[PDB]
Short mmCIF file of N, CA and C in Angstrom, two decimals:
data_model
loop_
_atom_site.label_atom_id
_atom_site.label_comp_id
_atom_site.label_asym_id
_atom_site.label_seq_id
_atom_site.Cartn_x
_atom_site.Cartn_y
_atom_site.Cartn_z
N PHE A 1 -97.56 46.74 100.16
CA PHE A 1 -97.46 47.99 99.35
C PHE A 1 -98.40 47.71 98.08
N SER A 2 -98.27 46.41 97.94
CA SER A 2 -99.65 46.00 96.47
C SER A 2 -100.97 46.42 96.74
N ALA A 3 -101.43 46.67 98.42
CA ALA A 3 -102.78 46.68 98.43
C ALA A 3 -103.11 48.04 97.87
N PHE A 4 -102.22 49.06 97.73
CA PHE A 4 -102.79 50.53 97.35
C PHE A 4 -101.78 50.94 96.36
N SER A 5 -100.65 50.72 96.35
CA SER A 5 -99.34 51.54 95.31
C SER A 5 -99.64 51.00 94.13
N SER A 6 -100.09 51.52 93.05
CA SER A 6 -100.67 51.01 91.68
C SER A 6 -99.27 51.39 90.77
N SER A 7 -98.49 50.60 90.39
CA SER A 7 -97.54 50.86 89.68
C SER A 7 -97.77 50.81 88.37
N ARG A 8 -96.58 51.51 87.63
CA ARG A 8 -96.75 51.45 86.18
C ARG A 8 -95.28 51.76 85.62
N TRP A 9 -95.17 52.33 84.11
CA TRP A 9 -93.99 52.52 83.74
C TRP A 9 -94.08 53.93 82.89
N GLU A 10 -93.04 54.29 82.82
CA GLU A 10 -92.89 55.70 82.00
C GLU A 10 -91.42 55.89 81.48
N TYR A 11 -91.25 57.00 80.47
CA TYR A 11 -90.16 57.22 80.15
C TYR A 11 -89.17 58.25 81.43
N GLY A 12 -87.94 58.19 80.98
CA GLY A 12 -87.33 59.32 81.91
C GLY A 12 -85.81 59.13 81.57
N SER A 13 -85.19 60.37 81.31
CA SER A 13 -83.86 60.73 80.83
C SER A 13 -83.04 60.65 82.31
N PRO A 14 -82.07 59.49 82.40
CA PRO A 14 -81.39 59.87 83.63
C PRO A 14 -80.12 60.73 83.51
N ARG A 15 -79.53 60.83 82.42
CA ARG A 15 -78.51 62.25 82.61
C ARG A 15 -79.15 63.21 82.03
N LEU A 16 -80.03 63.97 82.78
CA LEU A 16 -80.41 65.41 82.49
C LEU A 16 -79.27 66.47 82.68
N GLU A 17 -78.76 66.51 81.53
CA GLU A 17 -77.54 67.12 81.59
C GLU A 17 -77.96 68.88 81.29
N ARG A 18 -77.57 69.64 82.01
CA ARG A 18 -77.99 71.04 82.12
C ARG A 18 -76.89 71.85 81.63
N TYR A 19 -77.20 73.13 81.46
CA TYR A 19 -76.23 74.39 81.18
C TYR A 19 -76.70 75.56 81.60
N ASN A 20 -76.02 76.06 82.67
CA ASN A 20 -76.31 77.76 83.11
C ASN A 20 -77.75 77.59 83.59
N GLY A 21 -78.46 76.76 83.71
CA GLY A 21 -79.90 76.68 83.83
C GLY A 21 -80.74 76.36 82.66
N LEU A 22 -80.18 75.70 81.62
CA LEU A 22 -80.77 75.45 80.49
C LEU A 22 -80.46 73.94 80.19
N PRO A 23 -81.48 73.19 80.10
CA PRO A 23 -81.26 71.86 79.85
C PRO A 23 -80.45 71.69 78.69
N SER A 24 -79.78 70.32 78.20
CA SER A 24 -78.98 70.33 76.97
C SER A 24 -78.54 68.66 76.92
N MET A 25 -78.07 68.63 75.66
CA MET A 25 -77.46 67.08 75.44
C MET A 25 -76.32 67.38 74.38
N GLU A 26 -75.12 66.91 75.39
CA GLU A 26 -73.64 66.80 75.06
C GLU A 26 -73.57 65.76 73.93
N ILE A 27 -72.85 65.75 72.76
CA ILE A 27 -72.27 65.14 71.79
C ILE A 27 -70.93 65.11 71.61
N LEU A 28 -70.53 63.87 71.48
CA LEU A 28 -69.12 63.42 71.32
C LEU A 28 -68.94 63.12 70.01
N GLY A 29 -67.65 62.98 69.62
CA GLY A 29 -67.09 62.80 68.08
C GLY A 29 -65.76 62.96 67.97
N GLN A 30 -64.98 61.89 67.18
CA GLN A 30 -63.73 62.18 66.83
C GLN A 30 -63.60 62.85 65.31
N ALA A 31 -62.38 62.62 64.77
CA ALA A 31 -61.93 63.06 63.30
C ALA A 31 -61.31 61.91 62.69
N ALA A 32 -61.35 62.08 61.41
CA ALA A 32 -61.22 60.80 60.57
C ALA A 32 -59.32 60.63 60.78
N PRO A 33 -59.30 59.06 60.61
CA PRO A 33 -57.89 58.94 60.57
C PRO A 33 -57.23 59.52 59.23
N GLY A 34 -56.09 60.28 59.73
CA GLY A 34 -55.38 60.97 58.78
C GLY A 34 -55.90 62.29 58.20
N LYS A 35 -57.04 62.91 58.89
CA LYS A 35 -57.40 64.20 58.81
C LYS A 35 -57.45 64.88 60.03
N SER A 36 -58.03 65.92 60.21
CA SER A 36 -58.08 66.68 61.52
C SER A 36 -59.35 67.26 62.06
N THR A 37 -59.27 67.91 63.35
CA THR A 37 -60.58 68.20 63.70
C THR A 37 -61.26 69.55 63.22
N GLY A 38 -60.43 70.57 62.62
CA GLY A 38 -60.66 71.51 61.96
C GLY A 38 -61.38 71.32 60.55
N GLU A 39 -61.21 70.30 59.87
CA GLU A 39 -62.14 69.88 59.04
C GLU A 39 -62.94 68.86 59.38
N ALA A 40 -63.33 68.70 60.59
CA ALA A 40 -64.34 68.06 61.33
C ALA A 40 -65.09 68.93 62.22
N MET A 41 -64.66 69.91 62.83
CA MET A 41 -65.20 70.48 63.77
C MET A 41 -65.97 71.67 62.58
N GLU A 42 -65.50 72.13 61.76
CA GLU A 42 -66.27 72.93 60.73
C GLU A 42 -67.13 72.33 59.87
N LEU A 43 -66.73 70.95 59.87
CA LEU A 43 -67.71 70.09 59.15
C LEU A 43 -69.10 69.91 59.89
N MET A 44 -68.82 69.63 61.25
CA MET A 44 -69.83 70.00 62.17
C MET A 44 -70.77 71.17 62.08
N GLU A 45 -69.86 72.27 61.68
CA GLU A 45 -70.34 73.72 61.70
C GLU A 45 -71.24 73.75 60.54
N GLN A 46 -70.96 72.76 59.47
CA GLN A 46 -71.82 72.68 58.51
C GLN A 46 -73.00 72.07 59.00
N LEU A 47 -73.13 71.15 59.94
CA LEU A 47 -74.10 69.99 60.19
C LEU A 47 -74.85 70.98 61.69
N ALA A 48 -74.30 71.61 62.18
CA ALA A 48 -74.91 72.45 63.29
C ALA A 48 -75.80 73.80 63.09
N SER A 49 -75.15 74.12 61.99
CA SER A 49 -76.12 75.40 61.52
C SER A 49 -77.26 74.82 60.57
N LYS A 50 -77.50 73.62 60.43
CA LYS A 50 -78.77 73.17 59.60
C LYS A 50 -80.02 73.52 60.63
N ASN B 1 -137.01 58.57 88.44
CA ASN B 1 -135.92 57.68 88.79
C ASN B 1 -134.77 58.41 89.05
N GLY B 2 -134.74 59.51 89.88
CA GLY B 2 -133.48 60.27 90.24
C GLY B 2 -133.06 59.45 91.46
N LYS B 3 -132.61 58.40 91.38
CA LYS B 3 -131.87 57.18 92.18
C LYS B 3 -130.75 56.86 91.26
N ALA B 4 -129.87 57.69 91.25
CA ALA B 4 -128.75 58.19 90.01
C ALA B 4 -127.68 56.92 90.19
N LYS B 5 -126.96 56.88 88.99
CA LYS B 5 -126.06 55.92 88.72
C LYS B 5 -124.66 55.94 89.43
N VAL B 6 -124.09 55.04 89.97
CA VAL B 6 -122.84 54.93 90.53
C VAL B 6 -121.94 54.02 89.88
N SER B 7 -120.74 54.44 89.61
CA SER B 7 -119.82 53.22 88.99
C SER B 7 -118.46 53.28 89.94
N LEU B 8 -117.70 52.46 89.31
CA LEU B 8 -116.44 52.37 90.34
C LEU B 8 -115.05 52.70 89.04
N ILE B 9 -114.20 52.96 89.83
CA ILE B 9 -112.96 52.84 89.16
C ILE B 9 -111.75 51.75 90.12
N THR B 10 -112.19 50.75 90.34
CA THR B 10 -111.69 49.73 91.30
C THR B 10 -110.28 49.60 91.24
N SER B 11 -109.60 48.72 92.09
CA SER B 11 -108.03 48.84 92.56
C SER B 11 -107.24 48.31 91.40
N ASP B 12 -107.78 47.89 90.37
CA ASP B 12 -106.97 47.46 89.17
C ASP B 12 -107.02 48.48 87.92
N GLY B 13 -107.65 49.58 88.24
CA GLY B 13 -107.70 50.83 87.32
C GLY B 13 -108.94 50.64 86.35
N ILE B 14 -109.48 49.46 85.74
CA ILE B 14 -110.39 49.04 84.92
C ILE B 14 -111.67 49.32 85.81
N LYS B 15 -112.65 49.93 85.01
CA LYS B 15 -113.82 50.02 85.65
C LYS B 15 -114.46 48.71 86.00
N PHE B 16 -115.52 48.68 86.93
CA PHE B 16 -116.31 47.58 87.35
C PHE B 16 -117.44 47.55 86.47
N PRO B 17 -117.61 46.56 85.51
CA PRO B 17 -118.09 46.53 84.36
C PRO B 17 -119.71 46.84 84.22
N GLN B 18 -120.25 46.78 85.31
CA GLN B 18 -121.85 47.46 85.04
C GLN B 18 -121.88 48.49 86.25
N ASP B 19 -122.75 49.40 86.24
CA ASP B 19 -122.95 50.57 87.19
C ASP B 19 -123.95 50.08 88.27
N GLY B 20 -124.14 51.04 88.99
CA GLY B 20 -125.12 50.69 90.11
C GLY B 20 -125.92 51.91 90.87
N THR B 21 -126.75 51.60 91.89
CA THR B 21 -127.39 52.73 92.21
C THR B 21 -127.40 53.47 93.38
N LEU B 22 -127.26 54.72 93.34
CA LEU B 22 -127.14 55.52 94.62
C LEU B 22 -128.40 55.30 95.21
N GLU B 23 -128.36 54.66 96.42
CA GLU B 23 -129.48 54.37 97.00
C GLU B 23 -130.09 55.47 97.68
N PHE B 24 -129.46 56.22 98.52
CA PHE B 24 -129.74 57.34 99.35
C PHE B 24 -128.58 58.21 99.50
N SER B 25 -128.97 59.01 100.44
CA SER B 25 -127.96 60.19 100.80
C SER B 25 -128.25 60.01 102.31
N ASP B 26 -127.28 59.85 103.25
CA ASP B 26 -127.61 59.96 104.50
C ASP B 26 -127.50 61.48 104.95
N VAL B 27 -128.16 61.80 106.12
CA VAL B 27 -127.59 63.14 106.63
C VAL B 27 -127.06 63.13 108.17
N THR B 28 -125.65 62.70 108.00
CA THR B 28 -125.12 62.20 109.30
C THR B 28 -123.84 62.71 109.42
N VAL B 29 -123.72 64.05 109.13
CA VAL B 29 -122.37 64.90 108.95
C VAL B 29 -121.30 64.53 110.09
N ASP B 30 -120.14 63.86 109.44
CA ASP B 30 -119.28 63.66 110.59
C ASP B 30 -118.40 64.62 111.22
N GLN B 31 -118.65 64.84 112.20
CA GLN B 31 -117.78 66.28 113.11
C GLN B 31 -116.42 66.45 112.36
N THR B 32 -115.72 65.36 111.89
CA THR B 32 -114.44 65.67 111.55
C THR B 32 -114.09 65.95 110.10
N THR B 33 -115.02 65.36 109.28
CA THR B 33 -114.28 65.27 107.91
C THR B 33 -115.18 65.70 106.78
N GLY B 34 -116.41 66.05 107.07
CA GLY B 34 -117.30 66.47 106.16
C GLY B 34 -118.04 65.21 105.57
N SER B 35 -118.82 64.30 106.01
CA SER B 35 -119.27 63.32 105.65
C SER B 35 -120.87 63.34 105.13
N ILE B 36 -121.06 63.24 103.94
CA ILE B 36 -122.56 62.97 103.58
C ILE B 36 -122.76 61.56 102.89
N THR B 37 -122.16 60.77 103.73
CA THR B 37 -122.10 59.37 103.74
C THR B 37 -123.01 58.65 102.73
N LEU B 38 -122.75 58.47 101.58
CA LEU B 38 -123.81 58.02 100.62
C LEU B 38 -123.95 56.68 100.61
N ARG B 39 -124.55 55.83 99.67
CA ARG B 39 -124.64 54.52 99.63
C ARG B 39 -125.16 54.02 98.19
N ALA B 40 -124.34 53.37 97.66
CA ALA B 40 -124.35 52.98 96.22
C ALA B 40 -124.49 51.45 96.39
N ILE B 41 -125.78 51.01 96.14
CA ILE B 41 -126.12 49.25 96.24
C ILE B 41 -125.67 48.85 94.58
N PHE B 42 -124.85 48.16 94.54
CA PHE B 42 -124.35 47.39 93.28
C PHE B 42 -124.72 45.97 93.23
N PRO B 43 -124.90 45.38 91.83
CA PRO B 43 -124.85 44.11 91.61
C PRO B 43 -123.45 43.52 91.57
N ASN B 44 -123.42 42.12 91.99
CA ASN B 44 -122.04 41.69 92.24
C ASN B 44 -122.17 40.23 91.72
N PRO B 45 -121.90 39.99 90.27
CA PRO B 45 -122.19 38.83 89.52
C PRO B 45 -121.16 37.72 89.97
N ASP B 46 -119.84 37.87 89.97
CA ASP B 46 -118.77 37.05 90.30
C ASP B 46 -118.23 37.18 91.42
N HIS B 47 -118.75 37.71 92.42
CA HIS B 47 -118.24 38.16 93.65
C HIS B 47 -117.00 38.86 93.52
N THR B 48 -116.73 39.77 92.48
CA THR B 48 -115.92 40.62 92.17
C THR B 48 -116.05 41.97 92.99
N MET B 49 -116.42 41.90 93.88
CA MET B 49 -116.30 43.21 94.58
C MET B 49 -115.90 43.14 96.31
N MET B 50 -115.66 42.03 96.87
CA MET B 50 -115.15 41.76 98.25
C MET B 50 -115.47 43.07 99.32
N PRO B 51 -116.32 42.59 99.89
CA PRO B 51 -116.88 44.36 100.82
C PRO B 51 -115.67 44.49 101.79
N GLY B 52 -115.05 45.69 101.48
CA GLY B 52 -113.90 46.16 102.38
C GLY B 52 -112.64 46.59 101.85
N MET B 53 -112.72 46.52 100.45
CA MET B 53 -111.62 47.37 99.73
C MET B 53 -112.09 48.71 99.38
#
């Protein structure tokens, strides 16, 4: 194989996460100790509509 | 001097450093693949050509 196959390196994303035929990137996250998801999810909705 | 230049992209991707001359053109068309088999004569300073690759 070294007689002909000229190797190299490239990028590549292994987790090619899709969505109904659309590529996507899932993001996780918790909420604060002592606080709730609704003051964190709507906080994300302050930061996802950006 | 229509005996034109020929250069390489040899097996390591980097070009062979100096060019070389298309000596002639055959008229010896292979029946199978369409060969107008040319002939590029090259200088070979450090024997970095190894006839056969």
